[PDB]
Amino acid sequence: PQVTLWQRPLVTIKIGGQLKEALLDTGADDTVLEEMSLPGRWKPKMIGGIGGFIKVRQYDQILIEICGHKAIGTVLVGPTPVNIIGRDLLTQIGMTLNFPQVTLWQRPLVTIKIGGQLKEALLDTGADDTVLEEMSLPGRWKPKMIGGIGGFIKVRQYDQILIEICGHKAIGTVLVGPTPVNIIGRDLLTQIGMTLNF
Numbered sequence: 001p002q003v004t005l006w007q008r009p010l011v012t013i014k015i016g017g018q019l020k021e022a023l024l025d026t027g028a029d030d031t032v033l034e035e036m037s038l039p040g041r042w043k044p045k046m047i048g049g050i051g052g053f054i055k056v057r058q059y060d061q062i063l064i065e066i067c068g069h070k071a072i073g074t075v076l077v078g079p080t081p082v083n084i085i086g087r088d089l090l091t092q093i094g095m096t097l098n099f100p101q102v103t104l105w106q107r108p109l110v111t112i113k114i115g116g117q118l119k120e121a122l123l124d125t126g127a128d129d130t131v132l133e134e135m136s137l138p139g140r141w142k143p144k145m146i147g148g149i150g151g152f153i154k155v156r157q158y159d160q161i162l163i164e165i166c167g168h169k170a171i172g173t174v175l176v177g178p179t180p181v182n183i184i185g186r187d188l189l190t191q192i193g194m195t196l197n198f
Contacts, residue, residue, distance in 0.1 A: 027124025049149025
């Protein structure tokens with residue numbers, strides 16, 4: 001299947017004998033699920049994201065069926081607001097990002113130019129919105145809060161900002177704040193014709 005990004009790329013998964021919906025998230029290194037019952041031993045673990053860190057239980061060698069496809073790997077379980085399938089499992093089902101084609105064995109980074117400056121950013125299908133680390137942008141903005149793995153952060157919303165991502169230009173809203181990494185969300189991914197293919 002090919003998947004465009006005008007809506008969140010959700011899929012049905014079967015794990016631990018249970019059915020769940022999860023977000024195909026190219027911006028996630030690891031797969032993280034909301035609290036659920038899984039068989040066996042686990043290890044305590046802390047993972048970070050927008051908003052900070054959360055404690056999760058790490059289960060190893062867990063069978064997961066994602067769409068029609070099987071994979072076995074590590075699964076983290078904890079207080080994430082959304083079930084996310086990260087690159088660890090995307091690679092196993094042969095997922096690629098197309099806009100150039102990109103496999104997901106490494107973080108899908110691209111060079112962007114915004115506000116006259118050059119930055120590197122993560123192509124993040126799991127992000128509704130584009131969020132950049134603190135930077136100098138031209139003009140007026142509005143105070144805003146956005147949520148994520150470890151809670152919420154306050155960001156400045158700038159409207160009508162030109163961004164050039166890889167080759168391609170796009171205009172839209174950009175959030176600026178204490179995100180750990182620059183993220184290109186679906187708002188801009190759709191403008192450069194990005195798709196998920198598996």
